[PDB]
Design a protein around this ligand. Structure first.
Ligand SMILES: [Mn+2]
Ligand SMILES: [Mn+2]
Ligand SMILES: [Mn+2]
Ligand SMILES: [Mn+2]
Length: 245
């Protein structure tokens, strides 16, 4: 249920090569705006699978209007995944299919191309600084934000008692604390999504966005704990699985 080490070594080399293309600063005019004026379309992606099958899956791309957060585009399609899940290699399972959804959008409704994509999974908060959100960003050149629902324990980061103390100090929606690697680098932020949630999101740069803008936009997408673009992709892909099977 795990690729051989020689395969993982090839994948690590690919991740290191592609990381040279990540842009971890703002490159879009709306990103530097106090209310994100100019931002109209926010994307979300996720993949759901079946109980008893890690091959058959449903990949979903949704585009939401901003700031209303209403779904203006959905593409949910059944795919056959090839690689198993290995922590640190999520993109090699999901990202070829996500790229195909973006290309299908360009062909079908090019005027609904999202201005930024929230990805279910980390960006630079990653064993090699190149998570699935960076990987989608570099292959599509779209701005991308990584949003993970639990902490990837890399570069000295750990979900220990000290980390849980900082989570307790998050007290209102929008509060954050930085995830500082042993390198002295800020890899991402823990974010309290809303007043009535206590388990934080872990937000990090995917591509063509700064961390502080990525955190603020994620917060603006949080009707519930999971940001609405990811939440809709998650709900619709699982619903799609249920109906057809
Ligand atoms: Mn607007
Ligand atoms: Mn997912
Ligand atoms: Mn789930
Ligand atoms: Mn999901």
């Amino acid at each position: 249920e795990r690729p051989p080490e020689e395969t993982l070594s090839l994948w690590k080399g690919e991740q290191a090569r592609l990381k040279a293309r990540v842009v971890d600063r703002d490159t879009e005019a709306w990103q530097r705006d106090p209310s994100f004026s100019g931002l109209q379309k926010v994307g979300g992606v996720d993949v759901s699978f079946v109980k008893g099958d890690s091959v058959r899956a449903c990949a979903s791309l949704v585009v939401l209007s901003y700031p209303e957060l209403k779904v203006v585009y959905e593409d949910s399609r059944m795919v056959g995944l090839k690689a198993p899940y290995v922590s640190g290699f999520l993109a090699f399972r999901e990202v070829p299919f996500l790229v195909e959804l973006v290309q299908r959008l360009q062909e079908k409704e090019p005027d609904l191309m999202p201005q930024v994509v929230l990805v279910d999974g980390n960006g630079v908060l990653h064993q090699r600084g190149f998570g699935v959100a960076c990987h989608l960003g570099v292959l599509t050149e779209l701005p991308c934000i990584g949003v993970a629902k639990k902490l990837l324990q890399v570069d000295g980061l750990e979900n220990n008692a000290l980390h849980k103390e900082k989570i307790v100090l998050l007290q209102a929606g929008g509060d954050t604390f930085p995830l500082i690697g042993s390198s002295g680098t800020v890899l991402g932020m823990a974010l309290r999504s809303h007043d009535h949630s206590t388990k934080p999101l872990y937000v990090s740069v995917g591509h063509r966005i700064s961390l502080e803008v990525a955190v603020r936009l994620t917060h603006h997408c949080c009707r519930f704990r999971i940001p609405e673009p990811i939440r809709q992709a998650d709900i619709r892909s699982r619903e799609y699985i249920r109906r057809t099977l």
